[PDB]
């Protein structure tokens, strides 16, 4: 899709072993398949169907997303930060697009 713009809020550093809260959003209409037009016709579904967050090659969360998840999908969850590296965020579109984001973290 067009303009699938990631927005991640996470601390750029942590103490060794510290929990940090991760907040990840991306811009997406999340056409759910339930909405009707003025002709009274259902508008076809097209959503982001999966979100993953990895820290240093290791999954933090893996989310399977359904149409009831709101426009501009927002996920918030907690990471155990053992060592310096990076988060990698991935979003999978119903249309075959894959969106990615990368955020460093110092320890």
């Amino acid at each position: 899709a067009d303009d699938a713009k990631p927005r991640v809020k996470v601390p750029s550093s942590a103490k060794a072993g510290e929990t940090v809260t991760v907040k990840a959003l991306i811009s997406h209409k999340m056409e759910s398949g339930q909405r009707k037009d003025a002709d009274g016709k259902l508008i076809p579904r097209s959503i982001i169907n999966r979100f993953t967050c990895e820290l240093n090659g290791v999954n933090v969360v893996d989310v399977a997303i359904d149409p009831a998840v709101s426009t501009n999908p927002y996920f918030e969850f907690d990471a155990k930060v053992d060592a310096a590296g990076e988060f990698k965020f991935t979003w999978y579109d119903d249309d075959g697009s894959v969106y990615e984001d990368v955020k460093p973290i110092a320890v």
């Binding site: 759910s32 290791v58 999954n59 969360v61 998840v69 709101s70 927002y74 969850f77 990471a79």
Partner: protein, 111 residues
């Protein structure tokens, strides 16, 4: 049976749900059905599944926590078509599932 019960049964492997160890946070009254804040919390759970029992397609999301998760908390924003019950299901390492449930009032129905 119902769709919620068919998804629940697939998630438990044909077993009844249990109780305890899972917190479902939703607002008593959600002003906007299009965007309702939900938090689920379940120490030790391998996965937490979210269902909205009054939606046409009741499945919301299934949160799988990897080894790098500090804890088994997840928050999101969901759609509720009208006043309804929200259901959280938390599956433990041994495959057993606990159910938490709460009713959400919706002022502006979603969609």
């Amino acid at each position: 049976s119902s769709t919620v019960d068919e998804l629940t049964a697939a998630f438990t492997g044909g077993a009844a749900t249990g109780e305890g160890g899972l917190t479902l946070t939703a607002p008593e009254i959600a002003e906007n059905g299009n965007t309702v804040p939900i938090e689920v919390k379940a120490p030790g759970a391998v996965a937490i599944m979210l269902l909205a029992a009054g939606n046409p397609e009741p499945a919301v999301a299934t949160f799988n926590f990897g080894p790098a998760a500090a804890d088994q908390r997840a928050a999101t924003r969901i759609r509720l078509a009208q006043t309804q019950d929200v259901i959280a299901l938390a599956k433990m390492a041994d495959g057993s599932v606990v159910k938490a449930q709460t009713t959400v009032k919706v002022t502006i129905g979603g969609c």
